[PDB]
Amino acid sequence: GLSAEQIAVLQEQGFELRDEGWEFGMSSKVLFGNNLDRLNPDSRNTLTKIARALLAVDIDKVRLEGHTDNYGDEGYNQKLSERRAESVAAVFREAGMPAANIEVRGLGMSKPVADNKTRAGRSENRRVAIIVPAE
Amino acid sequence: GLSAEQIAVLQEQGFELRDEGWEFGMSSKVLFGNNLDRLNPDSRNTLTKIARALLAVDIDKVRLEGHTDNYGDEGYNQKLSERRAESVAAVFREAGMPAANIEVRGLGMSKPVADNKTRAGRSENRRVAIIVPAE
């Protein structure tokens, strides 16, 4: 389980404890914009600070999951979700996180957090999740 | 939002982060034994240490929630669950927590955490939970 100086850091960064562990989503929109899986460089820093802060307190084990809405090919949403997840993973590596400690899952359309019949609904399902397991 | 020192103390007392806050649960058999809402001496002593720990790091509020299984009259089980939480509240108040910062709830049979079908799940649901709300 996580130590008190860690949990606090997680809380500070915007993490919320859920069933699979501590979770913090960012929208694809903010993360990539018009790109497919290239991060615009502002989101890169945002993702660097985050990773640096976590490693600072010996959190060094994260899972990254990316989802899409249901619009589009089913096969493509899987790849995209996985590639987009990996894009973020590469920023964690480049900051000091043991690659063996990073897990990457493409979850495609299958796992939404909103009704997929709204511009703010569908744009909410387009996201990448940062997960520290509470193990 | 709880600080590292607060969280540290919470973990040392056996609390566990849930959905409604930090939460330590004790079974009714331990707290009450054969009694109704009178705690046995060993329990009051335990509860007093927990209470003093929470005060010594300036915790803002505690909620005390009594639960039963689903055997018996539902209104009796509601009252009992309430009287039982009020027994734990009293110990808090006597340890120096002000009434106004203490929330007492009898929840009867409505929030189980185990299966009422077995003798075991029934004894597990017979508990009073101490919650520190997540501001």
Author numbering:
A (entry chain A), B (entry chain B): 34 to 168
What do the authors of the reporting publication say about this deposited model?
The YfiBNR system contains three protein members and modulates intracellular c-di-GMP levels in response to signals received in the periplasm. YfiN is repressed by specific interaction between its periplasmic PAS domain and the periplasmic protein YfiR. YfiB is an OmpA/Pal-like outer-membrane lipoprotein that can activate YfiN by sequestering YfiR in an unknown manner. Previous studies suggested that in response to cell stress, YfiB in the outer membrane sequesters the periplasmic protein YfiR, releasing its inhibition of YfiN on the inner membrane and thus inducing the diguanylate cyclase activity of YfiN to allow c-di-GMP production.
We obtained two crystal forms of YfiB (residues 34–168, lacking the signal peptide from residues 1–26 and periplasmic residues 27–33), crystal forms I and II, belonging to space groups P21 and P41, respectively. The crystal structure of YfiB monomer consists of a five-stranded β-sheet (β1-2-5-3-4) flanked by five α-helices (α1–5) on one side. Each crystal form contains three different dimeric types of YfiB, two of which are present in both, suggesting that the rest of the dimeric types may result from crystal packing. Here, we refer to the two dimeric types as “head to head” and “back to back” according to the interacting mode, with the total buried surface areas being 316.8 Å2 and 554.3 Å2, respectively. The “head to head” dimer exhibits a clamp shape. The dimerization occurs mainly via hydrophobic interactions formed by A37 and I40 on the α1 helices, L50 on the β1 strands, and W55 on the β2 strands of both molecules, making a hydrophobic interacting core. The results showed that wild-type YfiB exists in both monomeric and dimeric states in solution, while YfiBL43P primarily adopts the monomer state in solution. The apo YfiB structure constructed beginning at residue 34 has a compact conformation of approximately 45 Å in length. Thus, YfiB alone represents an inactive form that may only partially insert into the PG matrix.
